[PDB]
Symmetry: C5
Subunit: 310 residues, 5 copies
């Protein structure tokens, strides 16, 4: 007959989410309730009903009594887990109450940058029983598992928190318990506005003003610089993210400005060429297209992407 293990997990802090390395880091507390009849003991009346053990001696106790503990791993843990507290409280009955406080990093392979920066992502911690269900089944320790109030994370904000149970088959042939803490969060886009969109629009608009000079050479020299600017903005954003083998929304928007700004150069080159072959008057007539093409192309291009991605 297999004994129930009551798995509770609360994330107190999100220390940060490194989206480039596709992981996040949390301060968190794991809580386990587990009745083991064999661990139960007798007290004299007036001697305490509850024994408080360091994890160190509590396991050395279990080893001595040849009792199996419900050994568990965090499947998506990365690197070290700095433990704060690992503390056991045992009762007359042989109910074990375990607390594990830790800061640690976790894999989140559920990262989809397709709609970056307008994206919503799945973050989750997996807690697996090493031992199969035929020995230990995990049950939800109700009234504990979730996320806290002061997470300290300013970019992401969390949509929903859910806890669910399931199997794995990592070390066993047999089905084995896995407690899961999931959360979805999505980005506060202020940064992306204030530092990327606003500037790129400011560059584009203030550039368009200088079309009313009707120096075609100046427009060419301007758009040529704009190109390098965007090629930089392309490097800014490229670093935020991993070396993805797919094309971001952001990725597309940049190549947008590329294509346009490439043509702005080519077009004004041709207008300027007419001026150079005694057809200045034509250019100046023709020119009106070029002045109104500029802004339409960027706003035709705005709907082009917005439909392709939404």
């Amino acid at each position: 007959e297999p004994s129930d293990v009551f798995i509770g997990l609360k994330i107190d802090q999100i220390t940060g989410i490194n989206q480039k390395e596709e992981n996040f880091s949390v301060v968190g507390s794991l809580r386990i309730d587990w009745r083991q009849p064999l661990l139960a003991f007798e007290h004299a009346p007036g001697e305490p009903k509850h024994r408080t053990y360091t994890l160190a001696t509590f396991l050395k106790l279990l080893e001595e009594k040849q009792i199996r503990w419900p050994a568990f791993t965090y499947h998506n843990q990365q690197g070290r887990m700095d433990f704060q507290n690992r503390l056991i409280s045992l009762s007359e009955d042989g109910t074990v109450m375990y607390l594990e406080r830790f800061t640690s990093t976790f894999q989140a392979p559920a990262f989809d940058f397709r709609l970056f920066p307008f994206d919503n992502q799945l973050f989750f911690i997996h807690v697996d029983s090493i031992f199969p269900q035929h020995l230990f089944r995990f049950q939800e320790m109700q009234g504990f598992s979730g996320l806290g109030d002061q997470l300290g994370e300013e970019e992401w904000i969390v949509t929903e928190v859910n806890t669910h149970l399931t199997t794995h088959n990592e070390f066993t042939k047999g089905d084995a318990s896995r407690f899961v803490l999931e959360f979805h969060a999505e980005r506060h886009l202020n940064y992306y506005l204030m530092r990327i969109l606003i500037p790129v629009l400011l560059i584009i608009t203030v550039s368009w003003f200088t079309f009313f000079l009707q120096d075609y050479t100046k427009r060419i020299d301007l758009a040529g610089g704009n190109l390098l600017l965007f090629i930089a903005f392309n490097f800014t954003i490229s670093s935020d993210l991993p070396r993805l083998g797919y094309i971001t929304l952001m990725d597309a928007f940049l190549v947008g400005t590329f294509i346009i700004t490439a043509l702005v150069v080519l077009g004004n080159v041709w207008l300027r060429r007419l001026e150079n072959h005694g057809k200045q008057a034509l250019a100046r007539k023709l020119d009106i297209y070029a002045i109104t093409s500029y802004p339409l192309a960027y706003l035709l291009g705005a709907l082009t992407l917005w439909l392709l991605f939404f």
Copy 2:
């Protein structure tokens, strides 16, 4: 009956405050006084009245005597806590004197960048009893808790230090002790002056000089460069801070220069356009307005923000 636990905490050093990751790091000493009658002992004459234990053996002693120790966590601790000393002194009377020296990082989610760089911030360490008040109540260990003299931090300087007790309900249903060390500090604005304001004003002023040349094309080319400069200064500052979903004061000041410098372009474009359509004399008349718009706009804009934020 619940036994009193006397919690003292002194921050010797502030190793630094990482405002981007919304945490700070301190060298600090935790001091606990706790009378446990059961631990009291008799000595032979010539054998010491105070027994000095490593935390390691002191707990192994408590486990052996089935005595519960007032287990505590630092709630806002991040990552590892490098311990220097963990030393126990047990008096005849059964008074435990504990010392914990450590360097460690702590969450400070009390970060409000609304008035950055003119801001005052709350930094605090929480020390929680894991066990409820029905078992242990924390009392302020007088004559210890506070901040030192040589903190070593050059940017922030501390306004006020306060200590107080209160409850939590982290692992218990029952109310539980929490000792709090708060401090407020505010930024030394010298850096922000010397590296950000002075330059931006220098750029703006030295730019305005070149208005007295009365080349409109040159002013357009100048203000266009100024734009990119500010777009950079925008990236400098953006990195100091997190990816906030709210707009800094600083954030606004930058977009200020943006809006203005955008118009300086638009305006001089129009003056230059008049020159290009045989209305050079008009431009040169209007020009006088344009020369005295530059300085007013930046100083109209100075009061615009200084009213909006204060």
Copy 3:
């Protein structure tokens, strides 16, 4: 007679591959099966058939019974190995079942940047027996060793995973077991396209447009800038990689643009020189060569490398 040790190793995560420091990092689980007759035990009915030990006490047990354990090292391990679980299960038969979960970095000196970024690389973990084959032989633990599904790595993608055994002679004169987990992976070229090729082609193309202006001075000033741009792109890429004593494909492609763009300068200098010595008409004739030389040389140069490297 030497006893068989059944070595399984599964990489759950690739935390990343630092190609500059010629190493990779993995979350992984090591599994060892090893029958030791001496460890075998009898149980009372109602006492467990399988005894579960912490590695700590399991070795202290082996030391006490003067039994030699099949000590192993990871030969290509770098720095610390953060252990998650080190857990032993001893059956009545005296079969030891060991599990070691860890995050760790490993050397991969099998790095050939000759065809970077179009390259396929060998990543491997070596597990050596410290003790010779005369004492312990390693055997492939079937049904476990390999790579998982959720590796979390976005740039590389894995072609093939193989396991095989072999000898070493690291500390012994005698032949000694070595279990090897190899994998090959190759790069997703999207990044290299979107951030390096597309820009460099965009710069080159939009530059060629400005040839139809037939300002030779402008072409010289342009190609001179292009040079510095490529000299930067040269620094971008240089950092991705180590300080290799061999020439990358990428390395060559950069020098290509160098040589060409150097020529464009020299050539247009000469065209411009003719203009300056009353031979403007000649230049304008010869110019047609220069206009079509530009694009040919970049695409002659494309086949030059694509033949030299393939």
Copy 4:
């Protein structure tokens, strides 16, 4: 026992891994040596057993706990973060003289930093070793012939002027006066880097700029000095990062603003010369111009003595 026992503290820095002026700390590999005679620890030895017993710190402390003997607990007051230990080894003599060796790499807070004269300055580095227990229980004495700095420190920027050791009290955990052993050293910066990477360039920019005054294009001088400004604004960011977010003004801090003020005026001035040209007074400008050509060099060297007097 027979009053307070003397404890002989020796500390030698074998190397300085580096000095991070931005975090106002330094990191050293060092060996701490303590001599401490305890009558109670003295033991009788059977012939064929060594006269000196060699213990790991862990066993030696577990032994002290067992024998209910209090050891002279000590902390490094200015230690920062983790201290990796190389060796912790105890040798117990028949006489009961305890010999402890602690080898470690560690970072130490140093609030002694004064950037007022940066980069031309000397700074004070110190490690504090505080006894937790008061002076009435234990007094620290200088273990002579050991304390100091080594030969191969490995540090190329700083070079050390003087090493001094002395003892004093603290009152950290006790009401009672308590021992504190101090290892101080002063070092000062090698100016070559600051020359080769900051001064030489800034002078090169300034001088090569002044050459282009002999062109007598006023527009070109304006465009040049405007660029010079941005250059210095960069050099301002280079240096700003070397240092913390100080609330005071460095020497270097001042020197940068110097170039600012000057280069701002060079613009303003040539703007005015150019303005005369634009209002048919080209001849005047060309007269005045001679003042302007000699002003640039004077102002930079008037400005050199301005600071060198204000700061020295």
Copy 5:
């Protein structure tokens, strides 16, 4: 009588050489052979001749038997040493065989950047006996100490490996053993060529082309830019190295281009000045000197340094 301790040390990997912090990091295995008669033991026939101990219990054994172990430090170790294996094999005869596998950083104060980047450097690990020679003398464990095959290091390549004994006087008055593993290595100049020399020569050469335009203003504007470029290249290289109080070869080469490029500016200023005072014809005569000065100056200057440094 003092007992011999057989010290072997093999570097398996060079994880890297941080030339800025004047240290290097290696994966390595320390091997010690040491006969202690007291550690010898008797076995029953059929009970093992060799006892295999964790370092942990092996020392607790030595402490119990009041035997002194040949305590050693790595003198030039920096920071933490991550240990892989610390394993003892005790024979009946009382021969201890010790293995210490570790990744660790080591000081190399033997750094001479005088001829950087054409330099050859000394890297060494010191292993000191804490105890004097009157108690333990170190002897070279032969057939093991040296460097491995797959070091993984791409910039440096190792010239020679030598091992030898010597004294120290670190904690003792008495002479004390020190085993030394030295190696020399020298740099692969490919990086320095491909990223620094080639570009600087490309800039200089492509600049010289624009002399054949015979625009003196353009040459001034060009050389002025070249200056800033080199001032950057000066910052690139400055960071590779520490804040050395001595002048590199590289250091000199840069100041070379400085001095020259400063004069190119001055000289063309003077040519241009002649044009401005009706002496255009003279300038155009003198010009031939200036055109052939530039190339000679850089190649006079190339031999100047190649003499002073070689």
